[PDB]
Design a protein around this ligand. Structure first.
Ligand SMILES: Nc1ncnc2c1ncn2[C@@H]1O[C@H](COP(=O)(O)OP(=O)(O)O)[C@@H](O)[C@H]1O
Ligand code: BEF
Lengths: 104, 95, 508, 98, 80, 95, 102, 90, 98
DNA sequence: ACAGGATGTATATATGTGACACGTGCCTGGAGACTAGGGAGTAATCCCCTTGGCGGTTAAAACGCGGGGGACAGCGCGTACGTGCGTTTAAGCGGTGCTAGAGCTGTCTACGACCAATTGAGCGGCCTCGGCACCGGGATTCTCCAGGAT
DNA sequence: ATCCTGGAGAATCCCGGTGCCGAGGCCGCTCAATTGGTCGTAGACAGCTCTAGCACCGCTTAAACGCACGTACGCGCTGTCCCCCGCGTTTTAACCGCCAAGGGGATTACTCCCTAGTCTCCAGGCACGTGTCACATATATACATCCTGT
């Protein structure tokens, strides 16, 4: 009898509803707005976690570390555009060297 | 006695186990994921509020959230998020 | 006859080499009386009647007695050349200069021919609309104007037009609005003409609106009587019997299956998938082959056989052309868009038929040269392409014997002035008007709108129309012995020049 | 002895510091600088250790980005060594006025 | 006083190596110190304003996160 | 029948005549000034709302607006604006 | 008496109060917040208009034009920093050419 | 009587930004000498910027269920991308 | 005749276009380009004249800023003539990815 | 060009250990049901505003040519940067002790939303005249020149 | 090889008349600002606390600092030659002028169904204690990589 189970979404619908009501972004909240929000957030989290898991499996690490998150974010172009200005703590930078700097 | 902060750690872990059963996540990565999700939620809520105030509409429906997603998320991310949100809204309003 | 001649001599002394007709003498006398009483009038006549002749006689008379003041002629570009030709032919010892060309050319012509002060040899300037509009504030404001004329005064339709402002900046004592069809599309646009010709008689638009079923007849008779002393009018059929009358035949053609599937692709929005909406359906009505070619991107013209047998009334068009070629008579073709003219010119050059086209891209010298070679007897040219906006105003193509309108403008007065370009003074053979219009399309709506607009100008069977015209009906329509034949026919309808329209309910 | 060229050691150092992903600035001098800059604005201000760590992380990321843009500027000028004019040009293009 | 000199030459060298700089000039260190001082001044001013708004005497990590977000650089992991 | 948009044109003209009696202002400059004032007002209101939501305070007082001014306006502009606002608030609460 | 005259401000206090209440940036609005907002907006407008009038008097023009506004905004470092990303329509850029170019 | 082919296919709308226009823009910017490919790269960058702004404005219009792109939508789209326009803004 | 050097005419043109403060791009080609780019996203979209004017103003301002940064890049490289690499470097430093 | 040695780096294995994940009490937030009202969905009008094209003209755009000033390739240098080593000094980790300050809980208390009437401020419209735009012209300045002195 | 001075020409600035359109002053009014009362809830404030920030002393060893160098790189001058720029010509497209049509923005009457607000309840989620397994560290070890002489 839960909205998250009815909508087939893992993220909580009631918590997002209460957050939107507390933030007072609108005087009246729509019925389908929290479900849409939960779906979008779940898809984004799933994409990021899948990319981070692929990066961690490529590095032969069982647990995802912030380094894997930053690598997956910088390697991905759409997530890189969505998350350009953000900096990840203990993530470093994407390893890349210019061709002019490398001796040929 | 103490405030119980509300985080998406359990849901992030569930989504990870759904997409990657064997791969785990540490505490720092969990906190980073929670911060990223909270930032995206705050950004989309602010964009939906701005859209509602621009059109002089006190209510925020799925249309406002879809427009905010199309505005914030770029390209394929926005398209897939809109598809997923429409599917979820249809499954919610049908059942 | 002799009294008209002697009156023309005693009124207009310099007018020699030509004789004014009885109606022309009455019109020029009316203009002299208007000048005497100081009331500016709107001289109006049918397109076939000679409007330039009465005005040129009036100007020659004004040059004769009293003083000789600066005279300004504002008219379209394609008619100022004919105006200068007629002022050189019908009025010797009278100077006139064409004020048109580049900035430096116009400036040097001004500084050479006309001085800063008044002069006895001051030539009557004949300029265009755009030239005068651009040079009023710069040059024309310095020189006074005792008498100005504006040929084709339908350009003065809009009351907020910039030409009105540029003319108001100019100072002129008397005016003369020359318009073949003084009344136009909706209502009260003539008030702008009335306000320009008579500022005090019609000061505001609300007054004319207040002027405006028995009371409808009462007010239309009242406005007809009010417009009587200022506006003169004569028709081609009532004053003179020397010119053969005209016959208007709306030749309906069924929309071909290619155009049928085009139209269904338009109404379900699947044309672009196969390979506003009003302009698209109109382009589908006339030569949609060029529409699909320009949306495809091909640089080469489609096959000429495919062009003629694929879409449009082009088949009925070719039937009419071969019938007229067997008839041995020149033809005039008017089109609304230059693309239709380009397609027709391409087809005619593919077939080898001699054609001359007059559009806005054609310069004044080429326009005059083409008019001259088409008005010539040795020239084997029979097909002459014209545009309804430029080539359909003020030109005298009398050598032609019939006109055919592939398209019809939303304003019926434009199509009227275009079809009456051939039927002028000196037309010996009877003229025929074949108005092409695809059947069961929106061109029928355009014609209905034009006729509802013609209703107010006059106040001052559908299944038989649906079919395609047969060869026997074409032959029944080809004969010219009736002008010197039912009113309705299969695929063709005869327009009543008096009254009537497609929708008689709106016409009444 | 074995004396390497100035290029291979620089490349090894670049690779090591790109793969390390740790804090390159010492914590105590950075904390001293942060406390001095804070006292410059308002006196008697205490600092949380996590706040100082976040400040250090943000400063390191910003300096790494600035060095990225400065190296781009230097390579554009056909010079391997970065110069103060490169940093000035990067700051001017990024819109970070002095 | 000399706390700006606390950021030593090896530290700036390591930062440039992580950036990808191969050769560093001697005058780069002072310019980098000045730029870092300007950036820290801006961020610390914003954080101190945020702290004074809440009538607190201790700068919180959330205040620094908000100050960095105001400048366009969002930091993840240290928030909260 | 028609919406009467609310602009600060009269107040901008009054301030201009106060600071410069002889100098006038055109319509384009007036519209640009109105747009600038509206943008500053919207920015400061959003910053005050964010500050109120950060401190879990439903009410926005002069303190929130002063903090938003100190955050948005740089340096001497912020100082002079804070001084003017404090003087105005004191004159309002005293009379 | 009006709130603007009561607070000694030329900008409308009631209109700003209505705007802040309609925007719903907060549930409740203090009494001094609209007065403070009006004072800040009035000071900013006065500064910008003074700079624009100075720029107009420099060009011997009595009317303030968008060009004068843009020149006054870009010349001042404070207003230039506040309106850095602002692009004023119908206004060019600062007249300046690099010394290497000359 | 020249041989005719459908003629004067319009030069691309990206080519509508002509070389003298880009030259005048560079002069206003303060450029003295301009290379050859500078015009083409300027056309490309302008196309990218217009694509972004027009996408944002079209999204704003679709949110309002309107078929016409008004000036306020363009102003909001520009404000989203950082560049604020005060003149045409309402 | 009088043939000026390529420098003085360029300086006069720069001064004239910095003092003119008008629209340098023609309205009709820019409107055609805007309509084409809009139809590329969604078809049957009408445009307001003021919206097209605002788009043109914003595009002109952005291109002027890009030319500012490109001239800065070129002067940094000790070259008077701007080159595509200068525009690419300016776009990369400004953070405007392709 | 190829063989070989010193250096750094990739790789398999043993044993911590401290951080990740799982079982549990419970409590505050999520969920079910009824209700009244204001925000939202919707049919019909219309009249301001957008679209498409013609006529033309004229200033802007475009093709072609000469040369000269700038981008670029190559070389000598000498100076500033990098690398390795003895040394030292300040970062970091451990351990304790103190207290200013963050946070929650109870109690009012002065301050802000709501609603009824209203009456003066600002937005809507038509002069209306003066600051501003375009123009012919004499005067001044900038610059291109082939000369003139040494 | 400069190095000052000379004159014609294109460009630029100051001054005079003007008219014209956009800025500026007036007025009936109407919808929003203001005043009087009330309330219950957000907020200011006194007090216990505990926990996290600040200061110091001792060992240490990794990191920072100064110096000798020699070698690779930033930098100035030179020859060029090819690409951008200045100008007569033309041609071609911007635009302002004009016109009918009609898709589309805004409003108002209505209603109705979606949602705010409240009492009750109980299950999902968070705080705390905990054992183990993934990952960090040390050591041996085979192997890839760099600098020099034959
Ligand atoms: N009195 C006349 N004698 C001979 N021809 C005449 C006469 N009057 C008019 N025309 C002919 O009429 C034409 C000039 O008048 P027209 O062009 O019809 O005036 P508009 O075009 O303004 O109606 C010429 O062809 C001319 O030969
Ligand atoms: F007056 Be025009 F010749 F018809």
């Amino acid at each position: 009898v839960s909205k998250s189970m009815k909508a087939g979404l893992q993220f909580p619908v009631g918590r997002i509803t209460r957050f939107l009501k507390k933030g007072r972004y609108a005087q009246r909240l729509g019925g389908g707005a929290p479900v849409y929000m939960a779906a979008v957030l779940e898809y984004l989290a799933a994409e990021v976690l899948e990319l981070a898991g692929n990066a961690a499996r490529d590095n032969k690490k069982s647990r995802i570390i912030p380094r894997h998150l930053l690598l997956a974010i910088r390697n991905d172009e759409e997530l890189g555009k969505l998350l350009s200005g953000v900096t990840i703590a203990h993530g470093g930078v994407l390893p890349n060297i210019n061709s002019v700097l490398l001796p040929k | 006695s103490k405030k119980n902060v509300e985080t998406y750690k359990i849901y992030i872990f569930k989504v990870l186990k759904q997409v990657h059963p064997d791969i785990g996540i540490s505490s720092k990565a969990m906190g980073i994921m929670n911060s990223f999700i909270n930032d995206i939620f705050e950004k989309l809520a602010g964009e939906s509020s701005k859209l509602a105030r621009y059109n002089k509409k006190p209510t925020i429906t799925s249309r406002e959230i879809q427009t905010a997603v199309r505005l914030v998320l770029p390209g394929e991310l926005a398209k897939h998020a809109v598809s997923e949100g429409t599917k979820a809204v249809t499954k919610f309003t049908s059942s | 006859e002799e009294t008209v001649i002697k009156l023309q001599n005693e009124l207009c002394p310099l007018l020699t080499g030509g004789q004014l007709k009885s109606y022309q003498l009455k019109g020029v006398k009316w203009l002299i009386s208007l000048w005497q009483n100081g009331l500016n009038g709107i001289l109006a006549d049918q397109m076939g009647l000679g409007k330039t002749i009465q005005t040129i006689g009036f100007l020659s008379h004004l040059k004769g007695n009293g003083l000789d003041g600066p005279y300004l002629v504002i008219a379209p570009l394609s008619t100022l050349s004919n105006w200068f030709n007629e002022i050189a032919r019908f009025t010797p010892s009278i100077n006139a200069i064409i004020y048109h060309g580049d900035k430096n050319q116009r400036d040097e012509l001004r500084r050479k021919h006309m001085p800063k002060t008044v002069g006895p040899k001051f030539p009557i300037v004949i300029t265009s609309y755009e030239v005068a509009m651009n040079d009023a504030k710069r040059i024309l404001r310095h020189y006074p104007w005792k008498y100005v004329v504006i040929d084709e005064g339908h350009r003065l339709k809009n009351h907020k037009c910039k030409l009105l402002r540029e003319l108001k900046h100019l100072k002129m004592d008397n005016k003369l609005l020359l318009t073949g069809t003084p009344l136009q599309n909706n209502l009260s646009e003539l008030w702008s003409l009335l306000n320009f010709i008579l500022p005090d008689i019609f000061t505001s638009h609300d007054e004319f609106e207040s002027w405006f079923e028995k009371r409808r007849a009462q007010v239309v008779s009242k406005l007809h009587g009010i417009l009587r002393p200022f506006i003169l009018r004569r028709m081609k059929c009532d004053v003179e019997l020397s010119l053969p009358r005209k016959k208007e035949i709306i030749m309906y053609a069924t929309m071909t299956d290619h155009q049928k599937k085009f139209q269904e692709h338009l109404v379900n929005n699947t044309l672009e998938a196969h390979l506003n909406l009003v302009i698209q359906l109109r382009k589908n009505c006339n030569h949609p082959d060029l529409l699909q070619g320009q949306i495809d991107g091909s640089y080469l013209y489609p096959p000429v056989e495919e062009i003629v047998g694929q879409c449009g009334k082009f088949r009925l068009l070719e039937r009419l052309l071969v019938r007229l070629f067997a008839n041995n008579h020149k033809v005039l073709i008017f089109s609304q868009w230059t693309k239709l003219l380009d397609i027709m010119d391409y087809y005619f050059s593919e077939k080898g038929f001699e054609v001359c086209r007059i559009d806005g891209s054609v310069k004044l010298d080429e326009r005059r040269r083409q008019i001259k070679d088409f008005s010539d007897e040795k020239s084997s040219c029979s097909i002459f392409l014209l545009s309804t906006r430029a080539g359909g105003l003020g030109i005298n193509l009398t050598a032609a014997d019939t006109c055919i309108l592939y398209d019809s403008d939303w304003n019926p007065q434009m199509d009227l002035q275009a079809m009456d370009r051939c039927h002028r003074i000196g037309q010996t053979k009877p003229v025929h008007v074949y108005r092409l219009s695809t059947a069961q399309s929106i061109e029928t709506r355009v014609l209905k709108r034009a006729y509802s607009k013609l209703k107010l100008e006059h106040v001052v069977e559908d299944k038989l129309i649906q079919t395609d015209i047969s060869d026997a009906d074409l032959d029944r329509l080809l004969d010219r012995s009736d002008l010197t034949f039912p009113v309705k026919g299969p695929g063709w309808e005869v327009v009543l020049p008096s009254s009537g329209g497609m929708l008689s309910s709106l016409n009444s | 002895p074995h004396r390497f060229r100035p290029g291979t050691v620089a490349l090894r150092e670049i690779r090591k510091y790109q793969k390390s992903t740790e804090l390159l600035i010492r914590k105590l001098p950075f904390q001293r600088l942060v406390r001095e800059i804070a006292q410059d604005f308002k006196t008697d201000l205490r600092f949380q250790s996590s706040a100082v760590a976040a400040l250090q992380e943000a400063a390191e990321a910003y300096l790494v980005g600035l060095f990225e843009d400065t190296n781009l500027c230097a390579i554009h000028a056909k010079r391997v060594t970065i110069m103060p004019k490169d940093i000035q040009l990067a700051r001017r293009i990024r819109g970070e006025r002095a | 006083r000399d706390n700006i000199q606390g950021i030593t030459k090896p530290a700036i060298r390591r930062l440039a190596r992580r950036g990808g700089v191969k050769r560093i000039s001697g005058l780069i260190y002072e310019e980098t110190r000045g730029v870092l001082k300007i950036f820290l001044e801006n961020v610390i001013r914003d954080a101190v304003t945020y702290t004074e708004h809440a009538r607190r005497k201790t700068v919180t990590a959330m205040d620094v996160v908000y100050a960095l977000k105001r400048q366009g650089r969002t930091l993840y992991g240290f928030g909260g």
